[PDB]
Structure 1
Amino acid sequence: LPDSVDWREKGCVTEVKYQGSCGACWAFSAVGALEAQLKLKTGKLVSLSAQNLVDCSTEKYGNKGCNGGFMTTAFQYIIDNKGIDSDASYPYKAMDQKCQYDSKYRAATCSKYTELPYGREDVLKEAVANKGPVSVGVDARHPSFFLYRSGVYYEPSCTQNVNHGVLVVGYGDLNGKEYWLVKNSWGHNFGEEGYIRMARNKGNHCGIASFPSYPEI
């Protein structure tokens, strides 16, 4: 496997989004993963509608919109629905709205998704290298997480009790510290222009490899 990977260098990652006061991290995590697959398949990089997921992949999928959801059930919604609209056609309002999906604005489809084995960072590395960005959940409730600015994030108080959906778009080594390159959805003001390098091969730090999954087209 390559020593380092950065899907941003392959034009497979869209701009960092700002979720605001709506707990739609799971939706942003899901579309980010599909966006990479879409690019890989069609050659075009297009942001997908996180709102579409918020408004439509709901109760039947065990999701609660601005109050939380799952990346895997979101993927299944896209599969069941036969598509997801583009972010441009169905803009993010950081609010729970009535489902307004319209296939005339479909920008991607999904045929299946895969959930990686719990806590295996070697398997996650392989997926990130061979398949593309992977949706994951991390424990982001520690004060240090919000204040992250640079370097490789390592928080002794972190746990494998995950609560925030984000996206791994690569991995590498910085000054002797292995890391996972994570795309967040708290805008460009957060961390490194919206990204955070989280400790890798440090005993599944913050549960990063606890619940990984990726979709395919």
Structure 2
Amino acid sequence: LPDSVDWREKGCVTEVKYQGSCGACWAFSAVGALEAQLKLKTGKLVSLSAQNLVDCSTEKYGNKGCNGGFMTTAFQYIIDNKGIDSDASYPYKAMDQKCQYDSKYRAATCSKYTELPYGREDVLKEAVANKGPVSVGVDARHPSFFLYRSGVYYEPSCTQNVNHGVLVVGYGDLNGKEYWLVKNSWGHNFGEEGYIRMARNKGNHCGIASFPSYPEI
């Protein structure tokens, strides 16, 4: 596998989003993963509707909108629904709304999704290199996470109990520290313009490889 990968270099990563006070991290993680696949299949980079997932991938999928959800069940909703609207057509309002999906605004589809084996960072590396960005959950409860500004994030107090959904868009090494390149959804003000480099091959740090999944078209 290549020593390093950065899907932003291949134009498969949309601009960083800001979820605000709505706990839609799972929705942003899911659309982020599908956006790359859409680019790989059609050649067009298009932001997909996280709001669409918040309002429509609800109870039947075990999700709670602005109060949390799963990336995998979001993917299944897209499969079942036979589509997902573009961000431009179904904008993000950071609130729970009635489902307003309309196929006339469909910007992507999904045929299946894959969940990687638990805590296997080399399997995650392979998927990021050969498939594309991967949705993951991390333990972002620690004060140090919110204050991350640069370098490679390593927190002694991190655990494998994940609570925040994000997107792995690459990996590599900085000044001897192997890392996973993570796209967050707390706006461009967070970390390095919306991104955070998290420790890689350090015992599944912060549970980054605990529950990885990616969609396909």
TM-score of the pair, normalised by structure 1: 1.00
Aligned to 1:30: 30
Deviation at 1:20? 0.1
Unpaired stretches in structure 1, ≥5 consecutive residues: none
What SS does the aligned partner of 2:153 have? coil
Deviation at 1:137? 0.1
In structure 2, what is the Cα distance between the partners aligned to 1:48 and 1:2?
29
In structure 1, what is the Cα distance between the partners aligned to 2:206 and 2:103?
38
Deviation at 1:87? 0.1
In structure 2, what is the Cα distance between the partners aligned to 1:161 and 1:136?
12
What SS does the aligned partner of 1:68 have? coil
Q: Per-residue displacement from partner, 1:121-171 (whole Å, max 9, x unpaired)?
A: 000000000000000000000000000000000000000000000000000
In structure 2, what is the Cα distance between the partners aligned to 1:108 and 1:100?
16
In structure 2, what is the Cα distance between the partners aligned to 1:182 and 1:202?
16
Deviation at 1:175? 0.1
In structure 2, what is the Cα distance between the partners aligned to 1:21 and 1:129?
33
In structure 2, what is the Cα distance between the partners aligned to 1:85 and 1:3?
35
In structure 1, what is the Cα distance between the partners aligned to 2:72 and 2:156?
29
Deviation at 1:97? 0.1
Deviation at 1:49? 0.0
Deviation at 1:35? 0.0
Give RMSD over aligned pairs. 0.1
In structure 1, what is the Cα distance between the partners aligned to 2:56 and 2:10?
31
Deviation at 1:190? 0.1
In structure 1, what is the Cα distance between the partners aligned to 2:147 and 2:91?
28
What SS does the aligned partner of 1:36 have? helix
In structure 2, what is the Cα distance between the partners aligned to 1:144 and 1:110?
36
In structure 2, what is the Cα distance between the partners aligned to 1:202 and 1:46?
34
Runs of 4+ in 1 over 6 A off after TM superposition: none
TM-score of the pair, normalised by structure 2: 1.00
Deviation at 1:31? 0.0
Aligned residues: 217
